[PDB]
Amino acid sequence: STGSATTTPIDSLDDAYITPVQIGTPAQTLNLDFDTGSSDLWVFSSETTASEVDGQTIYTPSKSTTAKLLSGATWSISYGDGSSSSGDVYTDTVSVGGLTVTGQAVESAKKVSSSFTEDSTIDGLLGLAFSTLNTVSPTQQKTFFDNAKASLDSPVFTADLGYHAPGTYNFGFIDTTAYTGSITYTAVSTKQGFWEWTSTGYAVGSGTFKSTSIDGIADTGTTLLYLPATVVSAYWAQVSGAKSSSSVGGYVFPCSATLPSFTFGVGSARIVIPGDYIDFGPISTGSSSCFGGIQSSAGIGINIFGDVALKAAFVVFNGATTPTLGFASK
């Protein structure tokens, strides 16, 4: 079997992407953030404190004839950004784009931090990292991908993210019309539970390619691209008036400048991020300082190939027994 769903940017900056997901019987449809950087499926619920809910669609297990409380199970999770949520756990039927999993763990938020309350557009997260990172205790639960793997025609999903436009998540097949040239696959390390791979180098604009190993993770749940200080400093040095700012928490640049492209290596291939994809617009309304889409990993501990990089490619997440990552240009 297969499934196919459209994902849509939540705002004008592509800050995150939401994908409709059917939970329960009869279906309750929530707009979930597909996150290959985590491994929990959590949703706002009829159990979330009414003060931490501002305009989201909530999951109501009492209205679902297939919902069952997973007695005694709890979860608690925190993200790199400082986000957090936690609560109890239900099992229910979950469908993505026609692909149905029965008995999927659905983690109901009794509490959410305010980064989540702040945005009305995201009803929850669908984690697509490896199940070893799932936070349910005492019995760790599997991700939607792991549960569906058995029934999928091929144990793959693909991320085809749009620049200021909708895109696609496909499960169980590779759409050969969605990309150009050939797909380059590269080895994944699952040791930390992430889709962790090694980039073979980078270039800035039309400069020469620098061959150097950059370990990092493919994370649809992270907006920006986070790379080592040396690489990042070499990129921003080519933008007149760019500087790392104190008050803002990263590199900013005059909104009047034109940004060079950025190339990263996948084995012997190259993926080019156009300079426009790196512009995240004014730090505040009317400001002439603009926020950059490439920022330093130093204060994170991990390099993150986030949406800014992923949207420049057709990405294959291959969850075969030896997992790999494929990149093609599009």
Query: Exposure pattern of 265-279 as b/e (b: 16+ CB <10 Å)?
Result: bbeebbbebebebbb
Query: Exposure pattern of 185-210 as b/e (b: 16+ CB <10 Å)?
Result: bbebeeeebbbbbbbbbbbbeeeeee
Task: Tell me the three-class secondary structure of 220-278, residue by residue.
Answer: CCCCCEEECHHHHHHHHCCCCCCEEECCCCEEEEECCCCCCCEEEEECCEEEEECHHHH
Enter the tokens of residue 106.
């659905």
Among 38, 86, 95, 199, the active-site one is: 199
- What is the resolution of the experimental data for this entry, in Å? 2.1
Among 14, 33, 35, 119, the active-site one is: 35
β-strand pairing of 210-218 with 304-305 = parallel
Cβ neighbours for 13, distance < 8 A, ≥ 6 positions apart: 280, 281
Three-state secondary structure call for residue 119 = coil
Give the C-alpha separation, 17 to 162, whole Å.
9
Annotated catalytic residue 35? yes
Enter the tokens of residue 154.
């091929």
